[PDB]
RNA sequence: GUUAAUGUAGCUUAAUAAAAGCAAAGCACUGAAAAUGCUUAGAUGGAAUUGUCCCAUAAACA
């Protein structure tokens, strides 16, 4: 019994809109599957012309759940869009106020 | 500027497109569910034959990822 | 299916007209992409 | 001269109404009610009613709201309830369908705002 | 954490109002203060769905409904029950029969004739001035042959 | 008891199928709205370049157009996934079977699964295992027997000896029912994509 | 046939006074998601009384 790490997905595509369109789709599929997405960060342009890369963070997987997820990603891929899966490495007043009580 | 008939044609095909996607999503959602149940059914089957093998198998593979393929 | 997310539209509030062009890969596959000028084809070197 | 509840200052909506209009949009159908403070419904117009269904095309629609509102108003006039209280939410108030429904009631003669109590 | 969280205000409101109706242990404000018809019904619906003109008006948001047709159909189907609510709401069943309740079934119709051009109807809860009620009203209630009656006002 | 293991290999489809006409028309609709939202001879050269692409042959979306019969070849399908499927002869049976190999309790399913990958294909194929959980188990009797069906994905494949004397066939779904009649072998579709 | 699944629409022990609610899907709105607005598809393949048969028909036995 072990729990998967949070694995980032860098979606690199020629067109920002296509990368965004695929980025949203995995997120909605992730949301439907109950996959939490913490961030949807964007990488800078790949200056040489340029290409646009978008992050969809995925946190939490299971052995059976991971297998069923990834092949679906292969199917979902429009083709010509380059997938990637990688293991991942300010606070407001309510968070700080609660944090004081725990250590006080 | 589009004429009302032009909008009517585009809206009519839009209705068909929305219906088609709803049909597509429903079929795919059930397909994924069925596959997982079959995998869960596959999990059960060998458990009857030998549960001890699963003790090692049910553990996730830490080294499986990262996996990249487009 | 790969067509599940293939059909997509721009998420930009402002943008010049984008023209369709196809990028030829070295394995022969083709991809529909949006380019600023009315080019017809692109080739990967 | 009858009493209207004046408290519930910390809660929304206010309860200073002799009668209230409740419009509920479910997946199927759309219902409009008139209920007294005691909790008894007096006049009810629903899209789940046989007579309205046969003369409409879809259970949920913008026109549906309009049509059910017109049907509700005639029953409201029939029942003699001329003054009523409606408490829409900000988005619901801005919703075009609800705006049209209110227009039907105003045209029908049902006043969506009750008069002040006499002390 | 297992349960989902309301993503919209309306979901909580609908849950809350339904929650309020249910009785509870703690004190609360409320305490102190046939088949053939189905098949025929379905068939008519399908015909209405098929009609392209119905779709076009709906998508053009210009459609409308005939109130009179609905009213007569409403009388046949559930008008008795709604009429019962008004009678209970107005206190008729408690002041008349000492709490006994009877569902009205005969679609009784009464109207006070004003001159000859038009006649004021008398629905449930309607407002009629005494001047309008000076003379006796016309009554048509669709008895059918036989079945003697008594009318009491 | 007869201990037997097997592997249900998966090869991803390289190239997509063509879009449906409803999908095509929607592409026009997203384009026409794009023109509406848009913000305001090199064309001859581009026309010269486009025909240069047309004359130059690209790899077909499906590599069957030339083949039409190369089941033994790894690239049987490009639009859909493939499953390794090899004719086998048993002591009391001669049936078209999913790749099988002999397994021991000491050896884990992946270890046998890894051996299945190269034992019956004898090639430099690249395949990966995601979970040690198996996907199918079927028992056929004449003497008790059981076959363990695993699942794997082909990362890449350099299928040497394309013309083997064996009848290895890559099937997606059409040949699964045609070649595997009994449910014990025709139910492989349940855990197949 | 032995065993044994199975007949409101994903779900409900919603409903026989009126075939329901929820879940679920598309488009628009630009950080994503959500929300909001406008739109979408459906049922009893059944008799049984409470608050199982018997069929459609699924199989291990056969």
UniProtKB/Swiss-Prot annotation, chain B:
Subcellular location as annotated: Mitochondrion
Coiled coil: none
Tissue-specific expression: Ubiquitous.
S-S pairs: none
Recorded family membership: Belongs to the mitochondrion-specific ribosomal protein mL40 family.
Complex formation: Component of the mitochondrial ribosome large subunit (39S) which comprises a 16S rRNA and about 50 distinct proteins.
Stated name of the protein: Large ribosomal subunit protein mL40
Organism: Mus musculus (Mouse)
Positions spanned in the full protein: 105 to 174 of 206
Curated annotation (Swiss-Prot), chain C:
Residue ranges the record marks as coiled coil: none
Protein's cellular compartments: Mitochondrion
Domain of life: Eukaryota
Similarity field: Belongs to the mitochondrion-specific ribosomal protein mL55 family.
Subunit structure: Component of the mitochondrial ribosome large subunit (39S) which comprises a 16S rRNA and about 50 distinct proteins.
Protein name as annotated: Large ribosomal subunit protein mL55
Record lineage: Eukaryota, Metazoa, Chordata, Craniata, Vertebrata
Gene: Mrpl55
From Swiss-Prot, chain D:
Keyword check for Ribosomal protein: yes
Main location: mitochondrion
Portion of the full sequence shown: 61 to 179 of 180
Superkingdom field: Eukaryota
Gene that produces this protein: Mrpl18
Protein name: Large ribosomal subunit protein uL18m
GO cellular component: mitochondrial inner membrane; mitochondrial large ribosomal subunit; mitochondrion
Keywords (A to Z) from UniProt: Chaperone, Mitochondrion, Ribonucleoprotein, Ribosomal protein, RNA-binding, Transit peptide, Transport
Family, per entry: Belongs to the universal ribosomal protein uL18 family.
Coiled coil: none
Location of this chain's protein in the cell: Mitochondrion
Organism this protein belongs to: Mus musculus
Swiss-Prot record, chain F:
Top-rank taxon: Eukaryota
Residues modified as N6-succinyllysine: 164
Swiss-Prot/TrEMBL keywords: Acetylation, Mitochondrion, Ribonucleoprotein, Ribosomal protein, Transit peptide
Chain ranges passing through the membrane: none
Main location, first listed in the record: mitochondrion
UniProt modified residues of type N6-acetyllysine: 146
Annotated signal sequence range: none
Single GO BP term: mitochondrial translation
GO CC field: cell junction; cytosol; mitochondrial inner membrane; mitochondrial large ribosomal subunit; mitochondrion; nucleoplasm
Molecular functions per Gene Ontology: structural constituent of ribosome
Subcellular location, record wording: Mitochondrion
Family: Belongs to the mitochondrion-specific ribosomal protein mL46 family.
Subunit structure: Component of the mitochondrial ribosome large subunit (39S) which comprises a 16S rRNA and about 50 distinct proteins.
Protein name: Large ribosomal subunit protein mL46
Organism (species): Mus musculus
Region of the whole protein represented: 43 to 275 of 283
